[PDB]
Amino acid sequence: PAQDNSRFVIRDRNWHPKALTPDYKTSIARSPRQALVSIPQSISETTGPNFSHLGFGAHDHDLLLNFNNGGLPIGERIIVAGRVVDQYGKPVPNTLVEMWQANAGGRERHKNDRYLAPLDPNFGGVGRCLTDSDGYYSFRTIKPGPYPWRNGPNDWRPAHIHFGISGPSIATKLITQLYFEGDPLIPMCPIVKSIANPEAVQQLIAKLDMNNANPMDCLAYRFDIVLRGQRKTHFENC
Amino acid sequence: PAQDNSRFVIRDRNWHPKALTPDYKTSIARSPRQALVSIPQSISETTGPNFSHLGFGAHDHDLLLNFNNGGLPIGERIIVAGRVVDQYGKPVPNTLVEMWQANAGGRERHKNDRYLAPLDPNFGGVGRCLTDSDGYYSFRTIKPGPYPWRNGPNDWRPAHIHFGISGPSIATKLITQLYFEGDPLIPMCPIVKSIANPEAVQQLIAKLDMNNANPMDCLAYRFDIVLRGQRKTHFENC
Amino acid sequence: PAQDNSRFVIRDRNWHPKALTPDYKTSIARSPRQALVSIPQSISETTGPNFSHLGFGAHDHDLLLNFNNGGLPIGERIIVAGRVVDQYGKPVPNTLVEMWQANAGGRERHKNDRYLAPLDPNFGGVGRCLTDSDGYYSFRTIKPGPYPWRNGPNDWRPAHIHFGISGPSIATKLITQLYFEGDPLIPMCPIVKSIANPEAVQQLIAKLDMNNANPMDCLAYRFDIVLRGQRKTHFENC
Amino acid sequence: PIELLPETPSQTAGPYVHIGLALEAAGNPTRDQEIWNRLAKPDAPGEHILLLGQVYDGNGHLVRDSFLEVWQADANGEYQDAYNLENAFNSFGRTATTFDAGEWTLHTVKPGVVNNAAGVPMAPHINISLFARGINIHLHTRLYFDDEAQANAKCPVLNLIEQPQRRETLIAKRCEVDGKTAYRFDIRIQGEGETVFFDF
Amino acid sequence: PIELLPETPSQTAGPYVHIGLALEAAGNPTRDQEIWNRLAKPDAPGEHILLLGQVYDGNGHLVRDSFLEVWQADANGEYQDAYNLENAFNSFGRTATTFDAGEWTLHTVKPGVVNNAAGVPMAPHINISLFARGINIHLHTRLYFDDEAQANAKCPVLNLIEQPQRRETLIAKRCEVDGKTAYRFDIRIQGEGETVFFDF
Amino acid sequence: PIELLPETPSQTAGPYVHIGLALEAAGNPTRDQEIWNRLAKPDAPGEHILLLGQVYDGNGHLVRDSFLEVWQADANGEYQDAYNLENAFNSFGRTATTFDAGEWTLHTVKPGVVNNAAGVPMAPHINISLFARGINIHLHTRLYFDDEAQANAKCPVLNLIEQPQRRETLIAKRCEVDGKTAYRFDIRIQGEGETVFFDF
Amino acid sequence: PIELLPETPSQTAGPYVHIGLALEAAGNPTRDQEIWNRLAKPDAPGEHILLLGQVYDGNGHLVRDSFLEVWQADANGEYQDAYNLENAFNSFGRTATTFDAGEWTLHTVKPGVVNNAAGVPMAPHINISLFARGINIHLHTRLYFDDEAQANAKCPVLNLIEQPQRRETLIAKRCEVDGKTAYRFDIRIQGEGETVFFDF
Ligand SMILES: [Fe+3]
Ligand SMILES: [Fe+3]
Ligand SMILES: [Fe+3]
Ligand SMILES: [Fe+3]
């Protein structure tokens, strides 16, 4: 079974976006009005699932082939790669990274998406993978397109890919959004502006990575993720 | 018939790209080694075709509908619009503006394009439009994608749309490439770098124009073109 | 046998010196006029020799003793050491480092050098060494002196040592020149000026290293070399 | 002071979280192995129960696009981390409320007792993470049981909540659904009866 | 000094200029009205001629992807700017060399004499603009006719070319292609026999 | 974008390259083990062949201070990387042209076929890297054989060179030197008949 | 991105807004022509109705100093934009709640149906802008009618509101004041039963 042998650095709730950010309108009714109750870390918060033996399909990390309907998706072919480390710089191996995104037109494959950009018959939009020994993951996919949503009368989300990272404990699990280097929609989006510090915003911007590109084939972007620092317990209970 | 009642401002050959720009490999065997011979403007160079009576199809400026074999193209729907003025700031009315581009995946609809990103069965990639009385033109199309090319071993063109603009005379006629705001491939392309002054590059950059977007539908880019200034002849032959 | 499992980051041909750099005169007739043709990497370009089993003599890396006709060379006794890594910072172990240089007065031991500074009967001017498991190499030698040459009418090569490094493949192999910190001839040498960016020049300047010096015996310089980065293939041919 | 690398900031899971994380629930085809809501196969030790609940925003309206992650000890109070679709019991699971089903459900076993780090027993609990559109950073809460009043009164985590009435929002109501013991746990994100959420 | 707005810089037409500018020649569907290589219909007044030529790069190899625009007076020496597919004669056309067709062709009428801005007659010529991959800003040239030798000798434009041998590079050679009077004009972008190009 | 550490820049090998890399050629005493021009020993399998050539500059003059490194597969198509003077075949070697010897020679065996990354076979080739005074960064080229015309016509590398006449500069001419089978490979750095050089 | 000139920012209308915009109601002398609360003259076409309502703040107290502007189609579904005291019907008018009078009143006709931009018919509605002290930028809302249950179920604007309970705040209740058909529409600025407000 799991053993309580770690503590995780406390989160900075001023770096992460606050709960109530009124310009992202849906956060008004879904944010708590009472203060969070702080509790000490026990074995319930410092352990979590390990997905080493989950059986992955061969193309679970490859979105150009995982939804194959006899063709190749239309859109910019890219590899999205990166490394998952904790705040001390230590790689996080065999952790589960899950991602989902729109197609190249901004249309998502879900019953409730009625935007007019068409579905792509060869593109599903979901992928998953386990970080290797060194903390690296990689996915292949098509660059998603921006899309409008009913927030303000003319809001458009920037192209983004959603990520879900498990880490070693439930204290580390995190959902976020990856955005693309240079995209001018970024500073105008009320979701991205739910983050107050412009330096935290930068951490979500994936950079063009010509070094990992496959010449004559696909470009590559680099997104490194940092999970809460993990440390051994010391002097506890005496 | 056409009359010699105009003169056009002399082109600044250090603002436009030179003929020999060795990083752009193909320019090497296709650039004159002798100097260009200057010749004074006559009626032969200061006049040119007027396309007012060319019969445009109804969909000629609309690339979401002018190819159409079943549906809509996959890609970010966008209006590319602007104004065509000469160097005195005077609108250029009734001029012809032709454009052509790749699909959302960087595949061009020509026999010789062998890149692996697929053709889009609903997308052709050509449009033409005549500017109005105020010098405005507009197209609706999908944002093209970058594509690789055999120049250096890992060269990728930035997403671009080619433009051809007639103007009032064969002296003002110009072919160029519109680029998109923020694309981080722009500073690495050897074709963009055929232009030496970084301020001349900036003029090829289309800006995101949220004001012209159709909400819940399509975004807009703004590209304005500036042709050689035109003036009436003065004090000629005395 | 060697197997194709690596890719090397494409060379930045604007960081390295160009082929035609007219102040360096001999390059005028020895530079190609047609463009280089780009080819994808295969097993022919990504593999190369390995020199672990070559039979090094015991003083191969020690120029104070490897030529020796009855004494010691006259000149500033120095150690030149450093590390060979790739563009990722990964060390390059068991690689071949060759070097050759002039003597203290700038005369080189070759029939065709007719420079009036004498030959030193205890000095040869050649060394080789294989890097260690961490990528370190090291040689001991005397500091070369500058010499004049037939380029411009009063050109003088700054003191330098020629280096050749094999690395893991023919794609990585490189011949270069080490210069010494502070030498006022460095910015006036046309060969060093073949490198257009001042930041690339700094990479060839060995720095004085008092920490590695043997007190009462020899100074030391540090010269680190960086070869093309190497990565595993990913998503190729699908 | 010593600064370390800053954590990647959180963002909302957004409306379509179901697509990457609840495939069946997004009406999309599934892959062979999915992380879902059945933590205990029928032959697993302990008492089998059904958990169900709904989510409310601060106007009293249902949240039909939520996604919840759970984490619990087995019947012996042991956290089983090696996740595997062939174990009789897995400590982790996921569930969701969709437009079709406004109520999530979970099948598992009543968790046994674990101690806090100071060695004091915590009452049986389930650890919950809630994620949805409008929630910029996920909300942590714990579900306790109304039939464990003795152990709930001594829980060193429940006694950190100052006001007694607030402790009540974490206690799921035992009921019966098809002759199966079930507990209902509703979450109120905001307002009257707002569920207690933690930070750790 | 007085600085005006700068002209939008030029870029190369690129390898696929045929998709936007010579549809048929790109082997793609055409629109109802296309600007093409037939400036004169059969009943246009004047001497009907066929023009043809090839384009060579600096190594001597054919340029198979060029696009060309011509501008010429009618037979009376008058420029007709009102472009229309119904006119028997248009002053403007376009033609291209392609992989299949290394040669371009133009169907037109031999132009009449036009004067320069000082009132001195120029010999009959066609104004050409050449575009293609590798050509960062198009190249301007003029096609003159070898059966107009006496007029060619006095043209004030051709007399601005300092060296007589370069003037020859502008003279198209009279020939017959299937009973029709034709003039061949090869452009040499670089090297031996380099075609004179202009700036204005 | 992501910037890695920059590669150390290349500098010319210089007129005295022979002193550190071609000892005998510099006319200096050799060490016990030298990397030289005899890739194959008399008993190595495959077809034994002598290669030779001359190197020209852009004025048509001989380069007598050039240094060449080669890399080739053995007769069965395999790259032998462990270099060792006792092996029967080493895939690597070096040679040089000097004032004395205007011509370089290399004693090896005709390479077997290898595949590109895409599984397509290449024609038999020898990889060459050329260094000298006046060359700032070394030139890469490929030596192919004129008697392998069927494989050359299908090599996916030779077909990346656009113009056919440029492909011929890479095809060494079978001849006989002292009655022995030989292929002459002259390199032209600049000018008429300039040899194709690659970047990879 | 393209930035346009920015819009002159809004500021509250202040407590004494009646002095510039409701002179009667401010108890000050009127000018010959005033824009007021009688949209329909006795003989205008359509169904003559009286509209009345109160405005409440977040504590539940009457806002007695508000000002309201309205814009409605006439009885045939046409926007009468050419304001004139002599028209039988003006599509625009203004009213206000004061201390004497806690309730605003408006005399008009029940508007006909107009289509939205996509060609779909919207239900009969009156557009309202509300202003007052404490209101920094005016509030937009729409008055719909309870006897038009069917057209309201299909209104593409009323369907843009997610929560069915929130749509009801836009529906005016039919009643009678002195034999005359009347609708009552109360506006709740903040709080429980908070009126939906638009942005466009
Ligand atoms: Fe999203
Ligand atoms: Fe292009
Ligand atoms: Fe030297
Ligand atoms: Fe006031």
Domains and CATH numbers, chain D: 1-200 (2.60.130.10)
**CA R_g for chain D:** 17
Sign of CA dihedral D52, D57, D61, D63: negative
Token pair of B178 as six digits: 């519109």
- d(CA D26, CA G18) in angstroms, rounded, equals 55
Backbone angles phi, psi at A127, to 5 degrees: -150, 170
**A140, A212, A216: residue with CB nearest C231:** A212
- d(CA D137, CA C221) in angstroms, rounded, equals 53
Chain G residues closer than 8 Å to B209 by CB: 1-2
Token pair of F14 as six digits: 């210089």
- d(CA F50, CA E151) in angstroms, rounded, equals 65
Buried b (16+ CB within 10 A) or exposed e, B145-164: bbbbbebbbbbbbbbbbbbb
What torsion do the CA atoms of E183, E189, E193, E198 make, to the nearest 10 degrees? 80
Please count the CA atoms within 13 angstroms of the CA of A91 that sit on its side-chain side.
Answer: 12
Query: How many Cβ contacts (< 8 angstroms) between chains A and G?
Result: 6
DSSP string, F89-157: B-SEEEEE--SS-SEEEEEEE-----B-TTSPBPPS-EEEEEE-TT-SSPEEEEEEETT-HHHHHH-TT
Separation of first and last alpha carbons in chain G: 22
Chain A residues closer than 8 Å to C8 by CB: none
CA of E189 to the centre of ligand 4 (A): 76
Backbone angles phi, psi at A154, to 5 degrees: -145, 55
Q: Report which bound ligand comes closest to the CA of C115.
A: 3
| Number of C-beta neighbours around residue E176 at 10 A | 9
Whose structure tokens read 């309907």? A69
8 Å CB contact between C61 and C97: no
Token pair of E84 as six digits: 């229309």
Q: Which CATH number does the domain housing residue C226 bear?
A: 2.60.130.10
What torsion do the CA atoms of C3, C5, C10, C16 make, to the nearest 10 degrees? -50
Closest CA to A192 of A149, A235, A231: A149
The verdict on C206 touching F (C-beta cutoff 8 Å) is: no
Asked whether the beta carbons of residue C34 and residue B28 sit closer than 8 angstroms, the reply is yes
DSSP summary character for residue F38: B
Residues 6+ apart with CB under 8 A from G192: none
Residues 6+ apart with CB under 8 A from E132: B30, E12, E13, E17, E55, E63, E65, E66, E67
Query: How many Cβ contacts (< 8 angstroms) between chains B and E?
Result: 266
- d(CA E171, CA E152) in angstroms, rounded, equals 9
DSSP string, B18-68: -S--TTSGGGGGGS-SSPPEE----HHHH---B-TTS---TTTTBTTTSS-
Q: Chains that contact D by 3+ CB pairs under 8 Å?
A: A, G
Per DSSP, the three-state class of C206 is: strand
CA of G14 to the centre of ligand 4 (A): 6
The verdict on A153 touching G (C-beta cutoff 8 Å) is: yes
Chain F residues closer than 8 Å to E61 by CB: 163, 165
Backbone angles phi, psi at C207, to 5 degrees: -105, 145
- d(CA B206, CA B194) in angstroms, rounded, equals 19
- d(CA E59, CA E188) in angstroms, rounded, equals 10
8 Å CB contact between B76 and A147: no
8 Å CB contact between A63 and A139: yes
DSSP summary character for residue C100: E
| Number of C-beta neighbours around residue B82 at 10 A | 23
Establish whether chain G is in contact with chain D, requiring a minimum of 3 CB pairs below 8 angstroms: yes
CA B157 to chain centre: 15
> Which amino acid is residue F179, in one-letter code?
G
Please count the CA atoms within 13 angstroms of the CA of C217 that sit on its side-chain side.
Answer: 9
The verdict on B30 touching F (C-beta cutoff 8 Å) is: no
The verdict on B222 touching G (C-beta cutoff 8 Å) is: yes
Establish whether chain A is in contact with chain E, requiring a minimum of 3 CB pairs below 8 angstroms: no
Q: Identify the burial level of E84 via C-beta atoms within 10 angstroms of its C-beta, where 0-12 means exposed, 13-18 middle and 19 or more buried.
A: middle
- d(CA B125, CA B140) in angstroms, rounded, equals 11
- d(CA D16, CA F193) in angstroms, rounded, equals 62
Q: Distance from B144 to chain F by nearest Cα, in Å?
A: 21
8 Å CB contact between C1 and F89: no
Q: Report which bound ligand comes closest to the CA of C156.
A: 3
- d(CA F52, CA F46) in angstroms, rounded, equals 19
The CA–CA distances, whole Å, from A214 to A77, A140, A218 equal 10, 11, 5
Closest CA to C179 of C213, C144, C154: C144
Per DSSP, the three-state class of C187 is: helix
Chain C residues closer than 8 Å to A61 by CB: none
Beta bridge partners of A205: A179
- d(CA D185, CA D187) in angstroms, rounded, equals 7
Please count the CA atoms within 13 angstroms of the CA of G46 that sit on its side-chain side.
Answer: 24
As for how many domains chain B has, the answer is 1
Asked whether the beta carbons of residue F1 and residue B184 sit closer than 8 angstroms, the reply is yes
**A152, A184, A188: residue with CB nearest G199:** A152
Token pair of B200 as six digits: 């001349």
- d(CA B109, CA B120) in angstroms, rounded, equals 9
8 Å CB contact between B64 and B214: no
- d(CA F183, CA F181) in angstroms, rounded, equals 7
What is the 3-state secondary structure of chain E?
A: CCCCCCCCCCCCCCCCCHHHHCCCCCCCCCCCCCCCCECECCCCCCCEEEEEECEECCCCCECCCCEEEEECCCCCCCCCCECCCCCCECCEEEEECCCCCCCEEEEEECCCCCECCCCCECCCCEEEEEECCCCCCCEEEEEEEHHHHHHHCCCCCHHHCCCHHHHHHHEEEEEEECCEEEEECCEECCCCCCCCCEEC
Token pair of B204 as six digits: 């090829």
Token pair of G33 as six digits: 């022509």
DSSP string, chain A: -----EEEPPP-TTTSPPS--TTSGGGTTTS-SSPPEE----HHHH---B-TTS---TTTTBTTTTT-SSSPPPS-EEEEEEEEEETTS-B--S-EEEEEE--TTS--SSTT---SSPP-TT---EEEEE--TTSEEEEEEEPPPPEEESSSTTEEEPSEEEEEE--SSTTT-EEEEEEETT-TTGGG-TTGGGS--HHHHHTTEEEE-TTS-BTTTBEEEE--EEEPPEEE--STT-
Q: Chains that contact E by 3+ CB pairs under 8 Å?
A: B, F
- d(CA E54, CA E70) in angstroms, rounded, equals 15
Give chain G's contact residues with B (Cβ, < 8 Å): 1-2, 4
| Number of C-beta neighbours around residue B3 at 10 A | 11
Binding site listing of D for 3,4-dihydroxybenzoate: 133
Q: Distance from D60 to chain G by nearest Cα, in Å?
A: 10
Which H or E element spans position C202?
A: helix C198-202
Asked whether the beta carbons of residue B116 and residue A153 sit closer than 8 angstroms, the reply is no
**In chain A, residues 59-98 whose CB comes closer than 8 Å to chain G:** none
Q: Chains that contact C by 3+ CB pairs under 8 Å?
A: A, B, F
- d(CA E163, CA E193) in angstroms, rounded, equals 12
Residues 6+ apart with CB under 8 A from D119: A237
Token pair of D80 as six digits: 């089983």
Which H or E element spans position C77?
A: strand C77-86
Chain A residues closer than 8 Å to B216 by CB: 115, 148, 150
8 Å CB contact between F188 and F155: no
Method by which the model was determined: X-ray
Q: Are strands B6-8 and B230-232 parallel, antiparallel or unpaired?
A: antiparallel
Per DSSP, the three-state class of C10 is: coil
8 Å CB contact between D165 and D193: no
The CA–CA distances, whole Å, from D38 to A3, A51, D42, D112 equal 24, 16, 10, 18
What is the 3-state secondary structure of chain G?
A: CCCCCCCCCCCCCCCCHHHHHCCCCCCCCCCCCCCCCECECCCCCCCEEEEEECEECCCCCECCCCEEEEEECCCCCCCCCCCCCCCCECCEEEEECCCCCCCEEEEEECCCCCECCCCCECCCCEEEEEECCCCCCCEEEEEEECCCHHHHHHCCCHHHCCCHHHHHCCEEEEEEECCEEEEECCEECCCCCCCCCECC
Q: Report which bound ligand comes closest to the CA of E12.
A: 2
- Which contacts qualify for G176-183: CB closer than 8 Å, 24 or more apart? G177/G50, G177/G52, G180/G48, G180/G49, G180/G50, G181/G47, G181/G48, G181/G49, G181/G50, G182/G49, G182/G50, G182/G51, G182/G52, G183/G49, G183/G50, G183/G51, G183/G52, G183/G143, G183/G145, G183/G146
Asked whether the beta carbons of residue B151 and residue C38 sit closer than 8 angstroms, the reply is yes
Domain that holds residue C27: 1-238
Q: Distance from G165 to chain D by nearest Cα, in Å?
A: 9
The CA–CA distances, whole Å, from B65 to A116, B219, C181 equal 14, 17, 66
With CA atoms as reference, the chain D residue closest to G166 would be: D59
Backbone angles phi, psi at F172, to 5 degrees: -65, 140
Q: Report which bound ligand comes closest to the CA of D17.
A: 1
Backbone angles phi, psi at G72, to 5 degrees: -140, 150
Q: Distance from A112 to chain G by nearest Cα, in Å?
A: 13
Maximum pairwise Cα distance, chain B: 64
Asked whether the beta carbons of residue F160 and residue B150 sit closer than 8 angstroms, the reply is yes
**D5, D20, D136: residue with CB nearest A126:** D20
As a residue count, chain G comes to 200
8 Å CB contact between C226 and F8: yes
| Number of C-beta neighbours around residue G37 at 10 A | 20
Which H or E element spans position C37?
A: strand C37-38
- Which contacts qualify for F40-44: CB closer than 8 Å, 24 or more apart? F40/F88, F40/F89, F40/F107, F40/F108, F40/F109, F41/F87, F41/F88, F41/F89, F43/F88, F44/F74, F44/F75, F44/F88, F44/F89, F44/F109
DSSP summary character for residue B202: H
Chain C residues closer than 8 Å to F91 by CB: 2, 49
Per DSSP, the three-state class of F177 is: strand
Per DSSP, the three-state class of D170 is: helix
CA of F9 to the centre of ligand 3 (A): 16
**Count helices and strands in chain D by DSSP H and E runs:** 3, 11
CA of C161 to the centre of ligand 3 (A): 7
Please count the CA atoms within 13 angstroms of the CA of G130 that sit on its side-chain side.
Answer: 28
- d(CA A208, CA A180) in angstroms, rounded, equals 8
- d(CA F109, CA A77) in angstroms, rounded, equals 43
Q: Are strands D48-53 and C230-232 parallel, antiparallel or unpaired?
A: unpaired
Whose structure tokens read 């006095």? E154
8 Å CB contact between B62 and B72: no
- d(CA F175, CA F186) in angstroms, rounded, equals 13
Asked whether the beta carbons of residue G2 and residue B181 sit closer than 8 angstroms, the reply is no
8 Å CB contact between E155 and E170: no
| Resolution reading in Å | 2.1
Asked whether the beta carbons of residue B153 and residue C38 sit closer than 8 angstroms, the reply is yes
Give chain B's contact residues with A (Cβ, < 8 Å): 71-77, 103-106, 115-118, 120, 142-143, 145-146, 148, 150, 153-154, 156, 181-185, 188, 208, 210, 213, 215-217, 219
The verdict on C50 touching F (C-beta cutoff 8 Å) is: yes
| Number of C-beta neighbours around residue G190 at 10 A | 12
| Number of C-beta neighbours around residue D169 at 10 A | 18
Chain breaks in chain F (C to N over 2.5 A) after: none
Phi-psi region of C29 (alpha: psi -120 to 50; beta: other; left: phi over 0): alpha
- d(CA E18, CA B66) in angstroms, rounded, equals 17
Which H or E element spans position D176?
A: strand D171-177
Establish whether chain C is in contact with chain G, requiring a minimum of 3 CB pairs below 8 angstroms: no
Residue G188 marked ligand-binding = no
Phi-psi region of C5 (alpha: psi -120 to 50; beta: other; left: phi over 0): alpha
What torsion do the CA atoms of E159, E161, E166, E171 make, to the nearest 10 degrees? -50
Q: Are strands C205-208 and C174-180 parallel, antiparallel or unpaired?
A: parallel
Token pair of G160 as six digits: 């843009």
Q: Chains that contact F by 3+ CB pairs under 8 Å?
A: A, B, C, E
DSSP summary character for residue D40: B
Asked whether the beta carbons of residue F2 and residue A211 sit closer than 8 angstroms, the reply is yes
- d(CA C98, CA E46) in angstroms, rounded, equals 78
Residues 6+ apart with CB under 8 A from A145: A75, A102, A103, A104, A105, A106, A117, A159, B75, B76, B104, B143
